[PDB]
Design a protein around this ligand. Structure first.
Ligand SMILES: COC1=CC(C)=NC(=O)C1CNC(=O)c1c(C)n([C@H](C)C2CCN(CC(C)(F)F)CC2)c2ccccc12
Ligand SMILES: [Zn+2]
Ligand SMILES: [Zn+2]
Ligand SMILES: [Zn+2]
Ligand SMILES: [Zn+2]
Ligand SMILES: [Zn+2]
Ligand SMILES: [Zn+2]
Ligand SMILES: [Zn+2]
Ligand SMILES: [Zn+2]
Lengths: 125, 365, 10, 570
């Protein structure tokens, strides 16, 4: 056509066959995930514990990109349909409930979701 | 007293008059062949062969057809198929050229870097693993067999201004790098992520797949510190598991990550401690871009200062140092001595200066 | 106190 | 006590400590060096052994075929009196250079970044410049109070060495403080790049190592702990606005009536449990609802069953009775290890046991009983109260939604007209609330929140350095992308600004009075949109869900492959 395009991430040139750009649905910046993970661990005074449940959550909403309060019920649902496998594994089912209560306190979830989410977590056990 | 004694057996000068920023002995040459070295300066790279005794034969030289280019550093490797040597040169244009001095042609070029390359390095164990550090704030690890960029060591906890030096450790398990932000940074390459990224880079072929190779962008180092040095850190080397690094505080400092006891591979990124073991005091090296080197066996440590004086320390000296360096001047060596390079056998020592001059110092019989 | 130059100086 | 007295005393202690530390270590280091030398020997040996197996045919020189009187040559003169050597000079040919760029991390939404009170780095430009005007190097340092890492008198400092300097300075001093307030001044003034004094005191606090941790509820040392301590970690650290713990966007914490809920709803009758319920002898529902009706103001004949409560369970009850309010059918079901009956008895036992005893950036308000009046932060800031405010449902200062039928890209929409994107909880009618994964939608005033940008392509600029090119063609006023970056205080912008002023290009774009966006260190692709006075784009800052977010739209219909520019007004 032609103009020599390049990759934004590595200033190496874009071969004609690669554009076709982009089939990927952008994005989550990789690093943002590691930053949280490390920035949570760094908390002197938070539980071991509470730290890992937060980490799992923060990753969940980063993956999914939740904008609105009305989403959060659906987001509490999805959190167990995906990460609820690895919650049981770590013995965090009680901190997860503590999270549900916090989320309920912030006014984001109906009380009808706290029982319905802990139902789906114990139904897979 | 001191060790080890040398005598200036020759000196010579290139025709351009611009500074020789980089000088490198070819350590890849099989024993009982002639000891070779290369120099970079102006827009050129020159190759010289030592001969017994004093005589330095001029072998080859190469000029970048772009007038403006200016090579800053070179590093030797080999083609493990055809058994050729391969010199790598890089400079101000941010472009790495690969010369093959048996075909006498630039067989490869990589043009991904944003700004200049201040140092090039090759993996001790892998003759295809080139590591370019830069003024663009990222280090770049390349697989020169596959024309692939493996890894870019910069971003969030990457460097904040120019990256001026880096060294692979003796086994090729980790990079310790440094630069203008005052900061030394430690980047492992034995981890699953990197070792995988290395493997898949070999398997990458551009006629086999419409995708590009997915170059791991590493944003985080395995350690960092700014408490050692107080201005730009210009040269850093791995003495086994300790760090030799110089800023312009009139010393090369021998330090380690963590506390006295803490082992290097058991250090965690968050580690906030370092420990100063010793300092190799020199005088009158106030400018930056003043490198040292050591010999293959790491028994001697040589820094050429800015007033033409070469300082050589012994690394079989237990305790500081403190005392005492073997200082060697000449009455026609004035200019700043950018970089020293021992021959493989520690017989010869080369040095190169700002005034295009090259100084050959050989050892006791 | 001071800032670093690559070249000295004459 | 003297101001310079403390410094001299800090100086001579430091000087002493460094010496007596050096001689102790000097013993250990010799061992470490010997040990390290042992590691060298091995690893060098391994490479050397590898070197034997290589045969590298090195050192070949070539004169022939004879010089055709076309090539230039390279001479090298000798102080040995061996004649000057001459070689023709090999031309390493054509390579296109890439434009200059500095490395930067990619972002999707912006990133709050703390101010840095000392510039850790002095920018090398100055050799070709030859220190002119050297005034710039002074005035650059003045913005940082004259503080650069590492500008001191003192030659070194480390953490293990630092804590001993505070402890040897507390020993030195009658006593005790027990940790002084005066001395942190003296050890900062000696170390500008480590100060202020405040920062060193907090650094000393992190270093000397755990209350108020509540330990693991899922764990072996789970204590019986009150509701607010069991949840202290979550309330204090959760972000209401973006839904993360320790978010990268919003630095102010909970408010704290954000994490108090309206107590209703509903308090409804629901029986049986069933069947082993809290029943049915006077005191079941009666004394339950009574105890909380006795607890709000400002039976039980059967002997209570015998079960034992672990530290987890007791906390978990307490945390549930807060949010479930006497619904022991629910609580028992939730606690899972007790029954409706036993919860009620433990409540009863617990009721009887004693306790021991110009535009501004939006930041929600929360004055619980009293209205959003001329003393409300928001109305002082001349900003609406948002959903995140903890005022009345019907505060008069809250932005309402839009009722729009559809697109809402004209002045008739109240959101568009306020320079706001819709609110996906309020704008229920246009479809800023509608199906999510389907990220293109009927309302076309939600694109920033949704990150729904056009495909942009990177190549060198047809004016200078780098520029950015839109793949897919787009119409007038249509959304191209958000300009993303770091978020920083007008101060920290003024420090970085001054340094970018010398490089004759800045990537700062002014967000509001309190904040600037800095795409320099980290940003996203649209940052490569160049400055052209006659541009093909414009840059509208908008208000989106409390965050002010930049919006880059077209100013004109644009053909495929066109290079994007916008005027930089600031
Ligand atoms: C912003 O990206 C670009 C857009 C356009 C239109 N043309 C371009 O060349 C680029 C790429 N430029 C850069 O990344 C540069 C960037 C990001 N800057 C800013 C001023 C950097 C320059 C280096 N300093 C170093 C520091 C940390 F300040 F010490 C940090 C700020 C440059 C200054 C001069 C030349 C190039 C840049
Ligand atoms: Zn937030
Ligand atoms: Zn019941
Ligand atoms: Zn209000
Ligand atoms: Zn209010
Ligand atoms: Zn308000
Ligand atoms: Zn509307
Ligand atoms: Zn609306
Ligand atoms: Zn709308």
């Amino acid at each position: 056509h032609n103009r020599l395009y390049f990759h934004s991430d590595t200033c190496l040139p874009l071969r004609p066959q690669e554009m076709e750009v982009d089939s990927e649905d952008e994005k989550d910046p990789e690093w943002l995930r590691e930053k949280t993970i490390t920035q949570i661990e760094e908390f002197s005074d938070v539980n071991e514990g509470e730290k890992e449940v937060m980490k799992l959550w923060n990753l969940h909403v980063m993956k999914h990109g939740f904008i609105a309060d009305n989403q959060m019920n659906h987001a509490c649902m999805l959190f167990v349909e995906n990460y609820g496998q690895k919650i049981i594994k770590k013995n965090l089912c009680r901190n997860f409930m503590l999270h549900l209560v916090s989320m309920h306190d912030f006014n984001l979830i109906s009380i009808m979701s706290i029982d319905k989410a802990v139902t789906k977590l114990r139904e897979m056990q | 007293k001191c060790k080890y004694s040398f005598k200036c057996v020759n000196s010579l000068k290139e025709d351009h008059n611009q500074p020789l920023f980089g000088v490198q002995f070819n350590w890849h040459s099989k024993e009982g062949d002639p000891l070779v070295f290369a120099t970079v300066g102006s827009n050129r790279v020159t190759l010289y062969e030592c001969h017994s005794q004093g005589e330095i034969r001029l072998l080859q030289s190469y000029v970048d057809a772009d007038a403006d280019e200016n090579f800053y550093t070179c590093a030797w490797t080999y083609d493990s198929n055809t058994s050729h040597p391969l010199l790598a040169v890089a400079g101000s244009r941010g472009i790495i050229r690969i010369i093959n001095p048996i075909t006498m042609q630039c067989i490869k070029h990589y043009v991904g870097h944003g700004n200049a390359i201040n140092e090039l390095k090759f993996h001790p164990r892998d003759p295809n693993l080139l590591l370019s550090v830069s003024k663009d704030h990222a280090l770049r690890l390349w697989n020169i067999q596959t024309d692939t960029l493996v890894a870019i060591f910069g971003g969030v906890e990457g460097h904040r201004d120019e990256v001026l030096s880096a060294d692979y450790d003796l086994l090729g398990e980790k990079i310790m790098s440094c630069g203008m932000d005052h900061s030394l940074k430690l980047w492992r390459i034995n981890s699953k992520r990197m070792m995988n990224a290395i493997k898949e880079s070999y398997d990458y072929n551009p006629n086999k797949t419409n995708r590009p190779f997915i170059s791991q962008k590493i944003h985080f180092p395995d350690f960092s510190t700014r408490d050692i040095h107080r201005n730009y850190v210009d040269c850093v080397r791995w003495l086994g598991d300790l760090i030799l690094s110089k800023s312009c505080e009139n010393a090369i400092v021998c330090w380690k990550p963590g506390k006295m006891e803490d082992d290097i591979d058991k250090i965690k990124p968050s580690e906030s401690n370092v420990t100063i073991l010793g300092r190799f005091d020199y005088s009158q090296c106030d400018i930056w871009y003043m490198r040292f080197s050591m010999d293959f066996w790491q028994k001697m440590l040589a820094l050429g200062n800015q007033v033409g004086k070469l300082y050589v320390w012994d690394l079989e000296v237990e305790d500081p140092h403190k005392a005492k360096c073997t200082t060697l001047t000449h009455h026609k060596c004035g200019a700043a001595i950018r970089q020293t390079s021992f021959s493989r056998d520690s017989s010869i020592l080369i040095a190169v200066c700002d005034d295009a001059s090259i100084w050959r110092w050989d050892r006791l019989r | 106190l001071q800032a670093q130059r690559k070249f000295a100086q004459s | 006590k003297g101001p310079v007295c403390w410094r001299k005393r800090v100086k001579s202690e430091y000087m002493r400590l460094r010496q007596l530390k050096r001689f102790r270590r000097a013993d250990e280091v010799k061992s470490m060096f010997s040990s390290n030398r042992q590691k060298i020997l091995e690893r060098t040996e391994i490479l050397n052994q590898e070197w034997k197996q290589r045969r590298i045919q090195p050192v070949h020189i070539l004169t022939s075929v004879s010089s055709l009187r076309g090539t230039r040559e390279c001479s090298v003169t000798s102080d040995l009196d061996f004649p000057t050597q001459v070689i023709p000079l090999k031309t390493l040919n054509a390579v296109a250079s890439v434009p200059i760029m500095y490395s930067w991390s990619p972002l999707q939404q912006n990133f709050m970044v703390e101010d840095e009170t000392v510039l850790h780095n002095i920018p090398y430009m100055g050799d070709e410049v030859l220190d002119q005007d050297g005034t710039f190097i002074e005035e650059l340092i003045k913005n940082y109070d004259g503080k650069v890492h590492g500008d001191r008198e003192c030659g070194f400092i480390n953490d293990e060495i630092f804590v001993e300097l505070v402890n040897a300075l507390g020993q030195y001093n009658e006593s005790r403080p027990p940790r002084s307030d005066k001395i942190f001044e003296a050890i900062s003034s000696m170390f500008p790049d480590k100060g202020t004094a405040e920062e060193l005191k907090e650094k000393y606090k992190e270093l000397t190592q755990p209350p108020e941790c509540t330990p693991n509820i899922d764990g072996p040392n789970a204590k019986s702990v009150q509701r607010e301590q069991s949840l202290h970690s979550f309330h204090t650290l959760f972000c209401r606005r973006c839904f993360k713990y320790d978010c990268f966007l919003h630095p102010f914490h909970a408010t704290p009536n954000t994490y108090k809920r309206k107590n209703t709803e509903t308090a409804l009758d629901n029986k049986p449990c069933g069947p082993q319920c809290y029943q049915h002898l006077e005191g079941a529902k009666e004394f339950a609802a009574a105890l909380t009706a006795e607890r709000i103001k400002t039976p039980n004949i059967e002997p209570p069953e015998n079960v034992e409560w672990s530290g987890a369970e007791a906390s978990m009850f307490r945390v549930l009775i807060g949010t479930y309010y006497d619904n022991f059918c629910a609580i028992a079901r939730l606690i899972g290890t007790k029954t409706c009956r036993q919860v009620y008895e433990f409540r009863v036992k617990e009721s009887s046991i004693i306790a021991p005893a110009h535009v501004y950036n939006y930041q929600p308000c929360d004055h619980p009983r009293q209205p959003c009046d001329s003393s409300c932060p928001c109305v002082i800031a001349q900003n609406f109260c948002e959903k995140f405010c903890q005022c009345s449902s019907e505060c008069q200062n809250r932005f309402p939604g839009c009722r729009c039928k559809a697109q809402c890209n004209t002045k008739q929409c109240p959101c568009y007209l306020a320079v706001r994107e819709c609110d996906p909880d309020l704008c229920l009618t246009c479809g800023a609330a509608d199906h999510w994964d389907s990220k293109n939608v009927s309302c076309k005033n939600c694109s920033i929140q949704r990150g729904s940008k056009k495909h942009l392509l990177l190549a060198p600029s047809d004016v200078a350095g780098w520029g950015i090119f839109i793949k897919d063609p787009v119409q007038k006023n249509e959304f191209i992308s958000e300009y993303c970056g770091e978020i920083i205080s007008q101060d920290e912008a003024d420090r970085r600004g001054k340094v970018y002023d010398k490089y004759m290009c800045s990537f700062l774009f002014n967000l509001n009075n309190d904040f600037v966006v800095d795409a320099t260190r980290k940003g996203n692709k649209i940052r490569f949109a160049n400055h052209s006075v006659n541009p093909n784009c414009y840059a509208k800052v908008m208000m989106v869900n409390g965050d002010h977010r930049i919006g880059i739209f077209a100013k004109r219909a644009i053909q495929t492959g066109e290079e994007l520019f916008f005027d930089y007004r600031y």
